[PDB]
């Protein structure tokens, strides 16, 4: 079961529903496509990678690597994380 998340510039990201439910905001917008008018593709792609990372490394034994964030996207990514509550 997948959901579609669409960036402000029209990029369509298809991710597993349970990964997307990492965000309580996204859960509300579903409860199965969501448009984000303020989140561009270079930010929303990173959010999707965060979902995969969180689900993979939550309650895991193996060593956890740093989630990497380029300085150029940090501000927009910060605003998106604040909105998405993840």
């Amino acid at each position: 079961m997948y959901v579609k998340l669409i960036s402000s510039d029209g990029h369509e990201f298809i991710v597993k529903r349970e990964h997307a439910l990492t965000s309580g905001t996204i859960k509300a917008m579903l409860s199965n496509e969501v448009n984000f008018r303020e989140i561009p593709s270079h930010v929303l792609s990173k959010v999707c990678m965060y979902f995969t990372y969180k689900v993979r490394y939550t309650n895991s034994s193996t060593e956890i690597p740093e989630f990497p964030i380029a300085p150029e996207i940090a501000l927009e990514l910060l605003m998106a994380a604040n909105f998405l509550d993840c």
Binding site: H11, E12, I14, K16, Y53, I73, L75
Partner: protein
């Protein structure tokens, strides 16, 4: 071992994982479940290289240490409209702004 992938065509990007030991064809079956297009109407690419159906993802260079959850590897996807295959085309993501002065 799991490999983490972004399968990309035009403005579509699929986030999924697969086994290193799974095949290219099996990856097409995953795309088929999501985009409703059968394997024979799909071509998968690593960069500009067309991938062979019977090869494992590991043989094609998708390994657990390079195709990571937080930095997944890209697989290009092209569809056959009716008779002929469209050319591989992946729309880039948007560009971030200039760093502000304070950053």
């Amino acid at each position: 071992m799991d490999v983490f992938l972004m399968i990309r065509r035009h403005k579509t990007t699929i986030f999924t994982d697969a086994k290193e030991s799974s095949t290219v064809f099996e990856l097409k079956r995953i795309v088929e479940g999501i985009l409703k297009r059968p394997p024979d109407e799909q071509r998968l690419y690593k960069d500009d290289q067309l991938l062979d159906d019977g090869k494992t993802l590991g043989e094609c260079g998708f390994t657990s240490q390079t195709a990571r959850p937080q930095a997944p590897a890209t697989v290009g996807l092209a569809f056959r409209a009716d008779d002929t295959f469209e050319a591989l085309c992946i729309e880039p993501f948007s560009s971030p702004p200039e760093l502000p002065d304070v950053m």
